[model samples]
Target chain A: VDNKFNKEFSVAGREIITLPNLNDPQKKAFIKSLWDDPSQSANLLAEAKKLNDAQAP
Target chain B: AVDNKFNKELQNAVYEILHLPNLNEEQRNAFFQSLKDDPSQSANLLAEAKKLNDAQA
Candidate 1:
């Protein structure tokens, strides 16, 4: 993957925000809304890691 | 072999996200796994989360 991880965000008048620096409240809501299934999340990580390891040079 | 800098960064990002209040172990694990599966999606995920938090705020 391209790993364009440093993506930024801008609102019309406010300073841009980065993921790592999001305020605690926003981070909490973000987590609550995104991952509705914990097991599937775990499975995805495990599977992706397995694939990434197999392909690593 | 499993501890590349990129992977460590990804893991750190997920760890930060997992610190939200009220999340169970499953939710925390799921969040970590989701990031591992789609590290590129972190931007969009945080954007969506911020929007949700902003709307609720």
Candidate 2:
């Protein structure tokens, strides 16, 4: 596995954001999902909780 | 393959929500950081938000 890597981000009107640096259609599909609007912040948090819970195990 | 997958998803996310053209420098960096830190996590956030958006719709 590799170790060295690079990252970037953007601050837009209180929301942490960034541009899609991808090319695959599958990934692009999900990226498009983020902008579904109506602000799913709460659900997003829940998902994070799931990941965290999984990590704890 | 993994890097490409990650970047592609990031690019897609930016397109769907922030719309690269509108994002500022800070958001760009943060987006990149999310990818470097955990591309899947970023995707999950986007997915979660989309789920909420869909429910609202």
Candidate 3:
């Protein structure tokens, strides 16, 4: 069955955070929809940068 | 298993354009896996990043 966290990850090199929704198909749909529209595409990338950067080490 | 034909070039392109400044190693791997799962989206992903770049200019 489909669930999030189909992949493996850990925090602090020990605490495993098995998120089940990590690969949510909805993300694909959302990205595709946003990219298909030029106006929203930039916004999507900007938002991704924010989220990814916030988690950066 | 993922197809052996996954596009490394596209994946690398996405990696470069995403500019994941803050993601830890694990998070980065997860992000790569996300892209690998849908290699076909790499083009659009790059397109979106370009749009963001243009907007910021």
lDDT (Cα atoms) of all candidates against the true structure? 0.40, 0.43, 0.43
Runs in model 2 lying further than 4 Å from the true structure: A1-57, B1-5, B19-36, B55-57
Per-residue alpha-carbon lDDT of model 1 for B1-25, expressed as tens digits? 5643454445345534443434344
Candidate 3's DockQ is 0.03
For model 3 the local lDDT of residue A22 reads 25
Question: Model 3: per-residue lDDT, tens digit, B1-57?
Answer: 766554455534443553433444554445445565776676666565556556656
Segments in model 1 whose C-alpha atoms lie over 4 Å from true places: A1-57, B1-12, B46-57
Writing each residue's lDDT as its tens digit, candidate 2 over A1-57 gives 432122211222123222223234533343334333215434543443454455452
* Higher-ranked by DockQ: 2 or 3: 2
Q: Write the per-residue lDDT of candidate 2 for residues B2-43, one digit (tens) a residue.
A: 344555565555545344344445545555556546666667
TM values, all candidates: 0.30, 0.29, 0.31
Chain A vs. true chain A, TM-score per model, equals 0.33, 0.33, 0.38
Please give the fraction of native interface contacts (Cα pairs under 8 Å between A and B) kept by each candidate.
0.00, 0.50, 0.00
Error of 3 at B56 (Å): 2.3
Which ten-residue region of model 1 chain B has the weakest summed lDDT?
B19-28
iRMSD for each candidate structure, in the order shown: 11.5, 7.1, 11.2
CAPRI-wise, candidate 3 is incorrect
Chain B TM-scores across candidates:
0.47, 0.42, 0.46
Candidate 1 reaches a DockQ of: 0.04
TM-score of model 1 vs. true structure: 0.30
